[PDB]
Structure 1
Amino acid sequence: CPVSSYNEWDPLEEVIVGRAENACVPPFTIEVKANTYEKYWPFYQKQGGHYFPKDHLKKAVAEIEEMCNILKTEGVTVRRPDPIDWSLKYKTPDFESTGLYSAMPRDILIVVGNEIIEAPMAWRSRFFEYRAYRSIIKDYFHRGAKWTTAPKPTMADELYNQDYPIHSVEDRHKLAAQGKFVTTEFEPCFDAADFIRAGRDIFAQRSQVTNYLGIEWMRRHLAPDYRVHIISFKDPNPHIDATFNIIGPGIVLSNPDRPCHQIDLFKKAGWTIITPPTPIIPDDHPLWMSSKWLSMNVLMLDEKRVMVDANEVPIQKMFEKLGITTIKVNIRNANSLGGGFHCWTCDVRRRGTLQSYLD
């Protein structure tokens, strides 16, 4: 069976790496605004609907191609999404919009066992993102994999708090604390990236794009074999792999700025919680999507080999003192699109079995 992955660290064998090509700035709408730092609002305000700076995209393409080269060198089989023009404007009976990109396979596909799951998504500009990955998915399907599509939302106004009070990150973070997010519980929605796998236990978080109905759908769909737990963090930010990236059996990277409220569950489990050192990325480099914390958004080739940013020396040193071989790759420009290694990939096959690490 080509598809088989139970966690984030077993020996990687096959992976899907995204594409920076024809990426479009999403129209500046409520759920987009709730996910971007003030600094960039005018960019989305003016640039919305057009491609991301073509000069910048060209540098991303180059960086990702090298990443793919190294992956092949490391013995990993690389598959890529199809080239597609995300500038096309589509219209459903509920809304009209243009696309985003097929850069982050982690945002939309998650693999549990022999099953590949397409996430519903929660952004209008990402409604038809799955189109970019259907060729790969049908191929695995013909080859034996189980294939699932979570219920695609309508994404009607009813799913969004049209009056979500975000005017700064300080408004979002307080509301978040209050349990207030731009998405309602009108219908199931979620980004696969708010789920991180550890064998029989998957951990998820309610976020701007993943609501509780989304989490219960997953919980209800994978049970009894898999337990989906909900954990929360201080100053929550969507996509868990940049706040709590699990890198080994009982070893996790906990972002110092976003401490987990349930850290004790893991302390009691005899888990090693590592706090990575601060990122060194220049504040002048643009990250239209995400935060500087992409430095901890690492991809493990196995327990002892990590693919880390070539520029983040401090975190490189940490892995090394720990006995983990750093495979330095530079993707500074690819980061602007909103993600690091874990985000730009989706592990389709890892050599290993299903186990419990929470005891």
Structure 2
Amino acid sequence: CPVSSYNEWDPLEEVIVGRAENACVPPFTIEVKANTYEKYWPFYQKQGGHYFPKDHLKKAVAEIEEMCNILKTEGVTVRRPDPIDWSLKYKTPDFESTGLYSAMPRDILIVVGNEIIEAPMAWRSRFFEYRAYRSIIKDYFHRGAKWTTAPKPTMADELYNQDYPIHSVEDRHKLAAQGKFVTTEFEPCFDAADFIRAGRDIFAQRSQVTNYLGIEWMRRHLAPDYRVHIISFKDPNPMHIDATFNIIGPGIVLSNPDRPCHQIDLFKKAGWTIITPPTPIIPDDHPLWMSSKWLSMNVLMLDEKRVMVDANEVPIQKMFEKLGITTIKVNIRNANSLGGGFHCWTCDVRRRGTLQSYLD
């Protein structure tokens, strides 16, 4: 079986790396608005449906090709999704929309053991995103891997709170604190990136795109072998957990200083080392259409002592170095604009290791 990964750190052998080609600006609908900084709302309002700036995409393609070269150098087998034009307008009986991209495999695929799981997603523009990854998945399936697709939502109006009172990121943080998100509990929905793996224990956060029904589905589907825990944070990211609580080793986690975890004591009690990374140094003028500046901690571990970290972020590089972790510096400053760092731009398919508990 070519598929086999129980955590985020065991020696990496095979990975799927995303594509920047033909990425499209999603139409400005409520769920897009609730997952982006106000600074860019007018960009979405105007550019929605068109491709992301092509000169910018071109630099990202180059950055990602180099990253793939380095992965091969580091002994990792790299697979890439199929090229697709994401501008095609599709129409289900519930809605009509254009696509986004297949830049982030971590948003849609999660590997638990020998099982590859396709997340349902929660954005109308990401409904048919799975199409880019099917060739790779069918191959793993032919070769023995288990293949699962969580229930694809209808994404009917009922899934969204069309009147979500958000006018600034400050409002959303407040609502998020009151348990109010743009997604209702009408049906299961979630992005795989809201889940982070540590062997028998998987951690999830209810976010703007991952509801409790979505987490319960995962929980029910993986029990009894795996345990899915729900954790929360202060001023959380609207979507995705990997630049907020990145588990980098057995009992070691990077905790974003701006998004403290409410359940941090569960981890201190388990004897876990909580490391808080230094601040990012990325220029405020550099466009980050999605995500925040914290992509610096969105690292990918090649193994426990080897991390792929952004070439520009010297301060977090030094941190890893004083920790005895070898830094493989790669520059993906332009790829970052699409919404992700090393962890998001990949999906670890096979890591050499076994299923263990680290929470004891």
Q: Cα distance, 1:161 vs. partner?
A: 0.3
Deviation string for 1:139-191 (max 9, x for gaps)?
00000000000000000000000110010001100000000000000000000
Inter-partner Cα distance in structure 2 for 1:274 and 1:70 = 27
Higher mean C-alpha displacement, 236-245 vs 312-321: 236-245
Q: Cα distance, 1:115 vs. partner?
A: 0.1
Q: Cα distance, 1:313 vs. partner?
A: 0.1
Q: Cα distance, 1:236 vs. partner?
A: 1.1
Deviation string for 1:47-93 (max 9, x for gaps)?
00000000000000000000000000000000000000000000000
Inter-partner Cα distance in structure 1 for 2:320 and 2:272 = 17
Secondary structure, aligned partner of 2:248: strand
- 2:249 is matched with 248
Q: Cα distance, 1:348 vs. partner?
A: 0.1
Inter-partner Cα distance in structure 1 for 2:162 and 2:128 = 23
Secondary structure, aligned partner of 2:187: coil
Secondary structure, aligned partner of 1:242: coil
Q: Cα distance, 1:194 vs. partner?
A: 0.1
Inter-partner Cα distance in structure 1 for 2:185 and 2:236 = 18
Deviation string for 1:186-240 (max 9, x for gaps)?
0000000000000000000000000000000000000000000000000011400
Deviation string for 1:308-340 (max 9, x for gaps)?
000000000000000000000000000000000
Structure 2: runs of 5+ lacking an equivalent = none
Q: Cα distance, 1:27 vs. partner?
A: 0.2
Instruction: Kindly tell me the number of residue pairs found equivalent between the two proteins.
Output: 359
- 1:58 is matched with 58
5 Å-filtered alignment, 1:36-115, equals 36-115=36-115
Inter-partner Cα distance in structure 2 for 1:269 and 1:294 = 27
Inter-partner Cα distance in structure 2 for 1:269 and 1:346 = 27
Deviation string for 1:98-126 (max 9, x for gaps)?
00000000000000000000000000000
Secondary structure, aligned partner of 2:294: helix
Inter-partner Cα distance in structure 2 for 1:77 and 1:194 = 25
5 Å-filtered alignment, 1:163-178, equals 163-178=163-178
Inter-partner Cα distance in structure 2 for 1:38 and 1:356 = 41
Inter-partner Cα distance in structure 1 for 2:342 and 2:165 = 32
Inter-partner Cα distance in structure 2 for 1:7 and 1:341 = 16
Inter-partner Cα distance in structure 2 for 1:266 and 1:286 = 35
Secondary structure, aligned partner of 1:306: strand
Deviation string for 1:17-63 (max 9, x for gaps)?
00000000000000000011111011000000000000000000000
Inter-partner Cα distance in structure 1 for 2:182 and 2:319 = 36
Inter-partner Cα distance in structure 2 for 1:51 and 1:345 = 22
5 Å-filtered alignment, 1:58-207, equals 58-207=58-207
**Please, what TM-score do these two structures have when normalized by structure 2?**
1.00
Inter-partner Cα distance in structure 1 for 2:266 and 2:41 = 38
**Please, what TM-score do these two structures have when normalized by structure 1?**
1.00
Secondary structure, aligned partner of 1:293: helix
Inter-partner Cα distance in structure 1 for 2:214 and 2:259 = 22
Inter-partner Cα distance in structure 2 for 1:150 and 1:199 = 20
Inter-partner Cα distance in structure 2 for 1:217 and 1:251 = 27
CA RMSD after TM alignment: 0.3
Secondary structure, aligned partner of 1:7: coil
Inter-partner Cα distance in structure 1 for 2:263 and 2:80 = 36
Inter-partner Cα distance in structure 2 for 1:336 and 1:180 = 27
Inter-partner Cα distance in structure 1 for 2:188 and 2:60 = 33
- 1:7 is matched with 7
Inter-partner Cα distance in structure 2 for 1:42 and 1:235 = 23
Inter-partner Cα distance in structure 1 for 2:55 and 2:219 = 42
- 1:234 is matched with 234
Inter-partner Cα distance in structure 1 for 2:30 and 2:162 = 7
Inter-partner Cα distance in structure 1 for 2:236 and 2:39 = 19
Secondary structure, aligned partner of 2:116: strand
Secondary structure, aligned partner of 1:341: coil
Secondary structure, aligned partner of 2:302: strand
Secondary structure, aligned partner of 2:338: coil
Identity value in percent:
100
Deviation string for 1:252-301 (max 9, x for gaps)?
00000000000000000000000000000000000000000000000000
Asked whether 1:351 is paired with 2:352, we answer yes
Q: Cα distance, 1:97 vs. partner?
A: 0.1
Deviation string for 1:330-356 (max 9, x for gaps)?
000000000000000000000000000
- 2:324 is matched with 323
Secondary structure, aligned partner of 1:8: coil
